[PDB]
């Protein structure tokens, strides 16, 4: 019917992940990369899981889709391009995530 | 298999 906002639906939030010594999470998927085992028709980037419960513990959740990173769009891009971008970033890494909604 | 990459 219309765009959602103040209700249960596809939201758009940002997260601040400071690298010290590193981010603390892995990424999967990508257009032409190794592939993502979460979505069949979607070849985007997903945060499969987290190891250290500190940097991306309360920020990012397992199985989330990354829409944008530090201004660089992560849609329709190749995996190798996504990883290279995340690694080159300075200390504080600002990212945008979204939670799907389908009943 | 390999697919997950830790950044």
Swiss-Prot record, chain A:
Subcellular location: Cell junction, Hemidesmosome; Nucleus membrane; Basolateral cell membrane
Superkingdom per UniProt: Eukaryota
Domain spans labelled PDZ: 12-101
Signal peptide boundaries: none
Tissues/organs with expression: Highly expressed in brain, heart, kidney, muscle and stomach, followed by liver, spleen and intestine.
Subunit relationships: Interacts with ERBB2, BPAG1 and ITGB4. May favor the localization of ERBB2, by restricting its presence to the basolateral membrane of epithelial cells. Also found to interact with ARVCF and delta catenin. Interacts (via C-terminus) with DST Isoform 3 (via N-terminus). Interacts with NOD2 (via CARD domain).
Assigned protein family: Belongs to the LAP (LRR and PDZ) protein family.
The protein's role, per its UniProt record: Acts as an adapter for the receptor ERBB2, in epithelia. By binding the unphosphorylated 'Tyr-1248' of receptor ERBB2, it may contribute to stabilize this unphosphorylated state. Inhibits NOD2-dependent NF-kappa-B signaling and pro-inflammatory cytokine secretion.
Protein name per UniProt: Erbin
Species name: Homo sapiens (Human)
Taxonomic path: Eukaryota, Metazoa, Chordata, Craniata, Vertebrata
